[PDB]
Each structure stands twice: as structure tokens, then as C-alpha cells.
């Protein structure tokens, strides 16, 4: 694509600059270009990819909810038209990310840390598609399938305090609660995840402890509202 002529290293450098400038669409385009070079991504690079698209789609999700709320209150074509415009752009971003994961990040991810990261991402962006879907069922089952594969690997290959495993469990629990309409599964998953992490904190350095307890706080935040 348009980043085909730029060095991989230069794309990564500019992704970092774009993050500093809060230019997240640029950041995402640079990391898309980096992925398309065909090499596997390092841990830092995966997180740049995720941060970039999370910020882009986050703005779209927030705009879509504003517009959807206005639309529902109003129930001329303008509100529906503009909600559809934003919705279509959001779906395009999700399709772009899913395309990168399928071509070919997931299949080339051999390690648990990379494969779980990408499968979690796959669940996340199917979940964002599900938020606006009205094929709804198949989108939901695609999210479920990706999250479940990531969960299975993470339980076999990672300690219960691993931040990737924790963020996965967090997001899968939210999927259960409000996408799958399975609130008891969501609560059970969040509780067990928090408890098993807590029992493993004693093995961690201070820095790893800070990483893990940050995500555990998010599990507890949700549980407080769910119970």
C-alpha cells in the first residue's frame, strides 16, 4: 500500500512519533505498513499496533454511540445517514485489523505471548463489530471463538498474573456480560481471574506486580458494578 516504499524501521519510528503527537490515525497507518512488511512483530511493536487502532476505533465507537442515542430519541433521514456513515467507517477499521491478523499475524505467531495477544485482538474487533451489528449471531460467535482459543492457550502457557492473560480475561468477561448476554459467566470469569492472579502475586517483582494489579483493578471495577 501507500507505506510500501518506507523502511520498516522508519514506519516503527514514525508510529512512536505519531503516538507522541496524539496522531492515532497516522500511527495506525504506519503500523499497518509495518505489519505488511511481512515480518513478525516484537512485543513493543504489537503494543504500538494495538494502541494505534484502539484509539482510532475508540473515537469511532464513542461517536457511534452519541449518534445512535440521538437516532433512537428521534424515533428526516440525516441522523440515520450520518450514524450509518460512522458505522461503516468503524466497520472498515475493524475489517482492516482483522485482515492484518488473518494475513498473516496469527498464523505466524508461534509463541504464547504473541498468539494470545493476536487472538485477543481478533476477539476485540469482532466485539466492536458486534456492538453495531443488527450476521449479528455469527459475528458474536467469531468473537467468542477467538477469545476462547486465546483463553485455552493462556491457561496452558501463561501464569495467572500475566498481563496479557489478565487483559484477555477482562475483555472476554465484558463480552460475556453485554454482547453474549451471559452476565453470570462474566462475573464468574472476572472473579476466578482476579482470585487466581491474587494468589500468584507473591511470585512477582515490584514492576510485574504493578503491571498485574493495574488490570486486576479493572476486573474489580467491573465486578463492583455487576454485583
Amino acid at each position: 500500500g501507500a507505506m510500501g516504499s518506507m523502511e520498516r524501521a522508519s514506519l516503527i519510528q514514525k508510529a512512536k512519533l505519531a503516538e507522541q503527537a496524539e496522531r492515532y490515525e497516522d500511527m495506525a497507518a504506519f503500523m499497518k505498513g509495518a505489519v505488511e512488511k511481512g515480518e513478525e512483530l516484537s512485543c513493543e511493536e504489537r503494543n504500538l499496533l494495538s494502541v494505534a487502532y484502539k484509539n482510532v476505533v475508540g473515537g469511532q465507537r464513542a461517536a457511534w454511540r452519541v449518534l445512535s442515542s440521538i437516532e433512537q430519541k428521534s424515533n428526516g433521514p440525516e441522523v440515520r445517514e450520518y450514524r450509518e456513515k460512522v458505522e461503516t467507517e468503524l466497520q472498515g477499521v475493524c475489517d482492516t485489523v482483522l485482515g492484518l491478523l488473518d494475513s498473516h499475524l496469527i498464523k505466524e505467531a508461534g509463541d504464547a505471548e504473541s498468539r494470545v495477544f493476536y487472538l485477543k485482538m481478533k476477539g476485540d474487533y469482532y466485539r466492536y463489530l458486534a456492538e453495531v451489528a443488527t450476521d449479528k449471531k455469527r459475528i458474536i460467535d467469531s468473537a467468542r471463538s477467538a477469545y476462547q482459543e486465546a483463553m485455552d492457550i493462556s491457561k496452558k502457557e501463561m501464569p495467572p498474573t500475566n498481563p496479557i492473560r489478565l487483559g484477555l480475561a477482562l475483555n472476554f468477561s465484558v463480552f460475556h456480560y453485554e454482547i453474549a448476554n451471559s452476565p453470570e459467566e462474566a462475573i464468574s470469569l472476572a472473579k476466578t481471574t482476579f482470585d487466581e492472579a491474587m494468589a500468584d502475586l507473591h511470585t512477582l517483582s515490584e514492576d510485574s506486580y504493578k503491571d498485574s494489579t493495574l488490570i486486576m483493578q479493572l476486573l474489580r471495577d467491573n465486578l463492583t458494578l455487576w454485583t
Binding site: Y24, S50, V51, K54, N55, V56, V57, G58, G59, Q60, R61, A62, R65, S69, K120, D124, G167, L168, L170, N171, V174, Y177, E178, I215, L218, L219, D221, N222, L225
Partner: peptide, 12 residues
């Protein structure tokens, strides 16, 4: 909408 906590940038 009440958005629950998910991983990473609370960008929405």
C-alpha cells in the same frame, strides 16, 4: 451508555 472497563486505551 455505561461502558465497562476493558484493556488498554480508554479511547471511547
Amino acid at each position: 451508555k455505561l461502558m465497562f472497563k476493558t484493556e488498554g486505551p480508554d479511547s471511547d
